[PDB]
From Swiss-Prot:
GO cellular component entries: cell outer membrane; pore complex
Full protein name: Outer membrane protein class 4
Effect of inactivating the gene: No visible phenotype when deleted in strains CCUG 37602 / M1080 / Serogroup B / Serotype 1 and 8765 / Serotype 15.
Coiled coil location: none
GO MF annotations in UniProt: porin activity
Keywords: Cell outer membrane, Disulfide bond, Ion transport, Membrane, Porin, Repeat, Signal, Transmembrane, Transmembrane beta strand, Transport
Subunit structure: The C-terminus exists in a monomer-dimer equilibrium.
Free-text comment about domains: The periplasmic C-terminus (residues 87-242) probably binds peptidoglycan.
UniProt GO BP: monoatomic ion transport
Organism of origin: Neisseria meningitidis serogroup B (strain ATCC BAA-335 / MC58)
Gene assigned in the entry: rmpM
Membrane topology of the entry: Multi-pass membrane protein
């Protein structure tokens, strides 16, 4: 049949602030609204994917991202999304997009630039790779 694919990207910042896996209240509100919409949608699958930046081992990133994806998926289930169609996977840094652009951007500032602030800048620059994507496939 006809499909429509949606990807809702929620940054780890918005979702967990500085914490490992505690959902911020505002995040829960947004996810509840999403779950409500999905319950009124001709959905096929709701795949929650956790992503991290390269600042971690394969093992560490996969575990953290899976936990974060699970927490988001569990919230959606708590708000009505059928367990039968939902999944939570940890993709770690496998699809990271900010490593090169950021390493280049930062090195472009070495004038005694704290040397430590360069790393801070790196972590801030690669923020887009720290997030959870909710991928929904529905029938048109």
């Amino acid at each position: 049949p006809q499909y429509v694919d949606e990807t809702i990207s929620l940054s780890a910042k918005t979702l967990f602030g500085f914490d490992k896996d505690s959902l911020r209240a505002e995040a829960q509100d947004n996810l509840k609204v999403l779950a409500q919409r999905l319950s009124r949608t001709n959905i096929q699958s709701v795949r929650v994917e956790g992503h991290t930046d390269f600042m971690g081992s394969d093992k560490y990133n996969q575990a953290l991202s899976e936990r974060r994806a699970y927490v988001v998926a569990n919230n959606l289930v708590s708000n009505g999304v059928p367990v039968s169609r939902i999944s939570a996977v940890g993709l770690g840094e496998s699809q990271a997009q900010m490593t090169q652009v950021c390493e280049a951007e930062v090195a472009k500032l070495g004038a005694k630039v704290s040397k430590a602030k360069k790393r801070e800048a790196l972590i801030a620059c690669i923020e887009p790779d720290r997030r959870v994507d909710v991928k929904i496939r529905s029938i048109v």
